Amino acid sequence: LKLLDNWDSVTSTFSKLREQLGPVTQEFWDNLEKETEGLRQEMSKDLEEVKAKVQPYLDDFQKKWQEEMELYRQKVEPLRAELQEGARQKLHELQEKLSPLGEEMRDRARAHVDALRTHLAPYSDELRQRLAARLEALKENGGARLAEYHAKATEHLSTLSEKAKPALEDLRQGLLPVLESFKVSFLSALEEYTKKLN
Amino acid sequence: LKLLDNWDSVTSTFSKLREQLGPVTQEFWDNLEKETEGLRQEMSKDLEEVKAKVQPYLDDFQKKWQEEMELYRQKVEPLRAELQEGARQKLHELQEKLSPLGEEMRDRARAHVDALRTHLAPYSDELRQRLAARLEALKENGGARLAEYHAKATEHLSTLSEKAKPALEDLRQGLLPVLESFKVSFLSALEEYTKKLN
Ligand SMILES: CCCCCCCC/C=C\CCCCCCCC(=O)OC[C@H](COP(=O)(O)OCC[N+](C)(C)C)OC(=O)CCCCCCC/C=C\CCCCCCCC
Ligand SMILES: CCCCCCCC/C=C\CCCCCCCC(=O)OC[C@H](COP(=O)(O)OCC[N+](C)(C)C)OC(=O)CCCCCCC/C=C\CCCCCCCC
Ligand SMILES: CCCCCCCC/C=C\CCCCCCCC(=O)OC[C@H](COP(=O)(O)OCC[N+](C)(C)C)OC(=O)CCCCCCC/C=C\CCCCCCCC
Numbered sequence: 001l002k003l004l005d006n007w008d009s010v011t012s013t014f015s016k017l018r019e020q021l022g023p024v025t026q027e028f029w030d031n032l033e034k035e036t037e038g039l040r041q042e043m044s045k046d047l048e049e050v051k052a053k054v055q056p057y058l059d060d061f062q063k064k065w066q067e068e069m070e071l072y073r074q075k076v077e078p079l080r081a082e083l084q085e086g087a088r089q090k091l092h093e094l095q096e097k098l099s100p101l102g103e104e105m106r107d108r109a110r111a112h113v114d115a116l117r118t119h120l121a122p123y124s125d126e127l128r129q130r131l132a133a134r135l136e137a138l139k140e141n142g143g144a145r146l147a148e149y150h151a152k153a154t155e156h157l158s159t160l161s162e163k164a165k166p167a168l169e170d171l172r173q174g175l176l177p178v179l180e181s182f183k184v185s186f187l188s189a190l191e192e193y194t195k196k197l198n
Numbered sequence: 199l200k201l202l203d204n205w206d207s208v209t210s211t212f213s214k215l216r217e218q219l220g221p222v223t224q225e226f227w228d229n230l231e232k233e234t235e236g237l238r239q240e241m242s243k244d245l246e247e248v249k250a251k252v253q254p255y256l257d258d259f260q261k262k263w264q265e266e267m268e269l270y271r272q273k274v275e276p277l278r279a280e281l282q283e284g285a286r287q288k289l290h291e292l293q294e295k296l297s298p299l300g301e302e303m304r305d306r307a308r309a310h311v312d313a314l315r316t317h318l319a320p321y322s323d324e325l326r327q328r329l330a331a332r333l334e335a336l337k338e339n340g341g342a343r344l345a346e347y348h349a350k351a352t353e354h355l356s357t358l359s360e361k362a363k364p365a366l367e368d369l370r371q372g373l374l375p376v377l378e379s380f381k382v383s384f385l386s387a388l389e390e391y392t393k394k395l396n
C-alpha cells in the first residue's frame with residue numbers, strides 16, 4: 001500500500017538521477033575530451049620518442065646481446081670441453097668405483113640376503129609355530145567368547161524386549177494425549193497466527 | 199513427567215546392563231587371562247628365539263658391517279684421493295678459466311653497463327622532459343578535472359539534499375506508520391507465541 005507512495009519517491013529519485021545523467025554526463029565527456037586532448041599530445045610525443053629511443057636502445061642492447069652471446073659462446077665452448085673432460089673423468093672416476101664397489105655391494109647383498117634367508121626362514125617358521133599357538137588361543141577364547149557373546153546377547157535381547165514392550169506401549173499410550181494436546185496447541189496457534197497473516 | 203518416566207526406562211536398562219557388565223568383565227578377564235597365559239609362554243619362546251638368536255644374527259651382520267665399513271674406508275682413502283686429484287685438475291682448470299672469463303666479463307661490462315650509463319643518462323634526462331609534458335597535461339587536465347568534478351560534485355550534492363531532506367521526510371512518513379503497524383503485529387505475535395508452550 002504505502003509501497004506505491006515510496007516507489008513514487010523512487011520515481012523522483014530516478015528523475016533526479018536522470019537530471020545528473022544530463023549536464024554532468026555531458027560534462028564528463030567534455031572532461032574526457034580534455035583528457036584525451038592532453039593524452040593525444042602525450043601519446044604522440046610518447047610513441048614518437050619511444051620509437052626514436054627504442055631503435056638505439058634495442059640496437060645497442062642487441063650489441064650487448066651479441067657481446068654476451070658471442071662472449072658466452074666463447075666461454076661455453078672451452079668450458080664444455082673442460083666440463084666434458086671433467087665429466088668423463090668423473091664418469092671414469094665413478095665407474096672405476098662402481099665396479100669394485102658394485103662387486104662389493106653385490107657380495108654384501110649376497111652375504112646379507114643369504115643371511116636373511118637363513119635368518120628369516122627360521123624366524124618365519126618360529127612365527128608360524130607362535131602364530132599357531134596364538135591362533136589356538138584365539139580359538140580357545142574365541143569359541144568361549146562366541147558362547148558368551150551369544151548368551152549375553154540373549155540376555156541383552158531379553159532386557160531389550162522387556163524394555164521395548166512397556167516402553168512402546170507407554171510411548172504410544174502417552175503419544176495419544178501428547179499428539180492430541182499438540183494438535184490442540186497447534187490448532188490454536190495456527191488459528192492465531194493466521195490472524196496475523198491476514 | 200515425560201523426562202522422568204522415560205529416564206526410569208533408561209535407568210532400568212543401565213542397572214540391568216551393569217548386571218550383565220559384571221559377568222562380562224569377569225569372563226572377559228578370564229579370557230584375557232587365558233590370552234595372556236598363552237602369550238606369556240609365547241613371549242617366553244618368542245623373546246627367547248628372538249634375543250638368543252638375535253646374537254648370532256647381529257654377530258653375523260656385524261662381521262659383514264665391519265668388513266663393509268673397513269672395505270668402504272679402504273676404498274674411501276684412494277677414492278677420495280682420486281676425487282681430490284681429479285677435482286684439483288678440474289678446479290685448477292676452472293681457476294685458469296675464471297681468470298680470463300672474469301676479466302673479459304669485466305671488460306664486456308665496460309661495453310655493457312658502462313655503455314648503458316651513457317645511454318640511460320640521456321634517456322632518463324629526456325624522460326624528465328617527457329614527464330614534464332605528461333605532468334603539464336596532467337596539470338591542465340588535472341586542474342580541469344578538479345574544476346569539472348567539483349562542479350559536478352556540487353550538482354550531486356544539491357540533488358543529493360533533495361533526496362536527503364524531502365526523501366527522508368517521505369521515509370519518515372513511512373517508518374513512523376510502518377513501525378506503528380509492525381509494533382501492533384509484533385506485540386500480538388510475541389504475545390501469542392507465549393500462549394502455547396510456556
Ligand atoms: C622503449 C619502450 C619502453 C616502454 C614500453 C614498455 C611497456 C610494456 C608494454 C605494454 C604494457 C601492457 C599494459 C596494457 C594492457 C593490455 C590490455 C589489452 O589490450 O589486453 C588484451 C590482450 C590480448 O592478447 P593478444 O592476443 O593481443 O596478445 C598476444 C599477442 N599476439 C597476438 C600478438 C602475438 O590481453 C593480454 O595481453 C593478456 C592475456 C590474458 C591472459 C589471462 C590468463 C592469465 C593466467 C594466469 C595469471 C598469472 C599471474 C602470474 C603473475 C605472478 C604472480 C605471483
Ligand atoms: C656438468 C658436466 C656435464 C655432464 C651432464 C650429464 C647429463 C646426463 C645426460 C642425459 C641423460 C640421459 C637421459 C635418460 C632419460 C631416461 C628417463 C627414464 O625413463 O628413466 C627411467 C629408466 C628406467 O630404468 P630401466 O633400466 O628399467 O629402463 C631402461 C629404459 N631405457 C631404454 C630408456 C634405457 O632409467 C633409465 O633408462 C636409466 C637411468 C638411470 C641411469 C643410471 C646410470 C648412472 C650413471 C652413473 C652413476 C652416477 C651417480 C651420480 C649421482 C650421485 C647422487 C648421490
Ligand atoms: C549406553 C552405553 C554408555 C556407556 C556406559 C555404560 C553404562 C553406565 C554404567 C556405569 C557408569 C558409572 C559412572 C562412571 C563415572 C563417570 C565420571 C564422569 O563424570 O564422567 C564424565 C566425564 C565427562 O568429561 P568432563 O566434562 O567431566 O571433563 C572435562 C575435563 N576438564 C574439566 C578437565 C576439562 O568423562 C570422564 O570422566 C571420562 C569417561 C568416564 C566414563 C566411564 C564409563 C565406562 C563404561 C563402559 C565401558 C566398559 C569398559 C569395560 C570393558 C573392559 C575392557 C578391557
Ligand SMILES: CCCCCCCC/C=C\CCCCCCCC(=O)OC[C@H](COP(=O)(O)OCC[N+](C)(C)C)OC(=O)CCCCCCC/C=C\CCCCCCCC
Pocket residue numbers: 230233234
Ligand atoms: C586388548 C588390549 C587393550 C587396549 C585396546 C587398544 C588396542 C591397542 C593395544 C595395546 C596398547 C595398550 C594401550 C593402553 C594405554 C592406556 C592409555 C590411556 O588410556 O591412558 C590414560 C590412563 C588414565 O589416567 P590419566 O590419563 O587420567 O592420568 C594421566 C594424566 N594425564 C593425562 C592427565 C596428564 O592412564 C593410564 O592408564 C596410565 C598407564 C598407561 C599404561 C601404558 C603402557 C601400556 C603397555 C602395554 C599394554 C598391554 C596390553 C596387553 C594386553 C593383552 C591383550 C591380549
Ligand SMILES: CCCCCCCC/C=C\CCCCCCCC(=O)OC[C@H](COP(=O)(O)OCC[N+](C)(C)C)OC(=O)CCCCCCC/C=C\CCCCCCCC
Pocket residue numbers: 244245248
Ligand atoms: C618378527 C619379530 C618377532 C617379535 C619380536 C619382539 C621384538 C620387538 C622389537 C624391538 C623392540 C623395540 C622397542 C624399544 C623401546 C625403546 C626405544 C627407545 O629407546 O626410545 C627412546 C628414543 C630416544 O630418542 P630421543 O630423541 O628422545 O633421544 C635423543 C638421544 N640421542 C642422542 C641419544 C640418540 O626414541 C627413539 O629411538 C625413537 C625416535 C625415532 C622415531 C621417529 C618418529 C617419526 C615419525 C613418524 C614416522 C612415520 C612413518 C610413516 C609410515 C607411512 C608409510 C606409508
Ligand SMILES: CCCCCCCC/C=C\CCCCCCCC(=O)OC[C@H](COP(=O)(O)OCC[N+](C)(C)C)OC(=O)CCCCCCC/C=C\CCCCCCCC
Pocket residue numbers: 310311
Ligand atoms: C646490466 C643490466 C642493467 C641492470 C643495472 C645494473 C645493476 C647491477 C649492479 C650491481 C650488482 C647487484 C645486483 C645483484 C642482486 C642483489 C643481491 C643483494 O641484494 O646483495 C646484497 C645482500 C645483502 O643482504 P644483507 O646480509 O646485508 O641483509 C640482511 C638483512 N636485511 C635483508 C634485512 C637487510 O647479499 C649480500 O650482500 C651477499 C652476496 C649476494 C650477492 C648476489 C649477487 C649475485 C650476482 C648476480 C646475479 C646472478 C646472475 C646469474 C646469471 C648467470 C649467467 C651465467
Ligand SMILES: CCCCCCCC/C=C\CCCCCCCC(=O)OC[C@H](COP(=O)(O)OCC[N+](C)(C)C)OC(=O)CCCCCCC/C=C\CCCCCCCC
Pocket residue numbers: 318
Ligand atoms: C632476458 C631478460 C630481459 C631483461 C632485460 C634487462 C634490462 C635492464 C633495464 C633497465 C635497468 C636500468 C636501472 C637503472 C640503474 C639505477 C637503479 C637505482 O636507482 O639504483 C639505486 C637504488 C637505491 O637503493 P635504495 O636506497 O632505494 O635501496 C635500499 C636497499 N637496501 C635495503 C638493501 C639497503 O637501488 C635499488 O633500487 C636497488 C635495491 C632495492 C632492491 C630492489 C629489488 C631487487 C631485486 C633483485 C636483485 C636485482 C638488482 C638489480 C638492480 C635493480 C635496480 C632497480
Ligand SMILES: CCCCCCCC/C=C\CCCCCCCC(=O)OC[C@H](COP(=O)(O)OCC[N+](C)(C)C)OC(=O)CCCCCCC/C=C\CCCCCCCC
Pocket residue numbers: 020351354355
Ligand atoms: C556517474 C554519474 C552517476 C551519479 C553518481 C552520484 C553519486 C554522488 C557523487 C559524488 C558526491 C560524494 C563525493 C565525496 C566523497 C568523499 C571523498 C573524500 O573526501 O575521500 C577521502 C576521505 C578521507 O578519509 P581518510 O581515509 O583519509 O580518513 C580515515 C580516518 N582515520 C585516519 C582518520 C581515522 O574518505 C572518506 O570520507 C570516506 C568515505 C567512504 C564513502 C564510500 C561510498 C561510496 C559510494 C558509492 C560507491 C558505489 C560502487 C557501486 C558498485 C559498482 C560495481 C561496478
Ligand SMILES: CCCCCCCC/C=C\CCCCCCCC(=O)OC[C@H](COP(=O)(O)OCC[N+](C)(C)C)OC(=O)CCCCCCC/C=C\CCCCCCCC
Pocket residue numbers: 391
Ligand atoms: C516454533 C517457534 C519456537 C518458539 C520459541 C521462541 C524463539 C526462540 C528464539 C531464539 C533463541 C534465543 C536467542 C535470541 C536472544 C537474543 C540475543 C540478542 O539479540 O542479544 C542482544 C545482543 C546485543 O549486543 P549486547 O547487548 O550483547 O552487547 C552490548 C555491547 N556493548 C557493551 C558494547 C554495549 O545481540 C548480540 O550481541 C548479537 C546480535 C544479534 C542480531 C540481532 C538483530 C539486530 C538487527 C539488525 C542488524 C542486522 C542483523 C542481520 C543478520 C541477520 C539476522 C536474521
Ligand SMILES: CCCCCCCC/C=C\CCCCCCCC(=O)OC[C@H](COP(=O)(O)OC[C@H](N)C(=O)O)OC(=O)CCCCCCC/C=C\CCCCCCCC
Pocket residue numbers: 190193194197
Ligand atoms: C499460519 C501457518 C504458519 C505455518 C508455517 C509453516 C512453515 C512453512 C515453511 C516453508 C514452506 C515453503 C517451502 C518452499 C520450498 C521451495 C521448493 C522449490 O524450490 O520449488 C521450486 C520453485 C520454482 O519456481 P519457478 O517455478 O517460477 O520455476 C522456474 C525455476 N526457477 C527454473 O529455473 O526453472 O521455487 C519456488 O518455491 C517458487 C515458486 C512459488 C510459487 C507460489 C505459489 C503460491 C502459493 C501460495 C499462495 C497462497 C495465497 C493465496 C492468496 C493470494 C492473494 C492474491
Ligand SMILES: CCCCCCCC/C=C\CCCCCCCC(=O)OC[C@H](COP(=O)(O)OC[C@H](N)C(=O)O)OC(=O)CCCCCCC/C=C\CCCCCCCC
Pocket residue numbers: 369
Ligand atoms: C529506505 C531504507 C533506508 C535504510 C536505513 C538503515 C538505517 C539503520 C540504522 C542504524 C544502523 C546502525 C549502524 C551502526 C554503525 C557503527 C559502526 C561502529 O563503528 O561500530 C562500533 C563497533 C565497536 O567499536 P569499538 O571501538 O568499541 O570496538 C570495541 C573495542 N575494540 C573492544 O575490544 O572492546 O565496531 C565494530 O565492532 C564493527 C561494526 C561495523 C558495522 C557494520 C557497518 C556496515 C556498513 C555498510 C555495509 C555496505 C552495504 C552496502 C549495501 C548496498 C546494496 C544495496
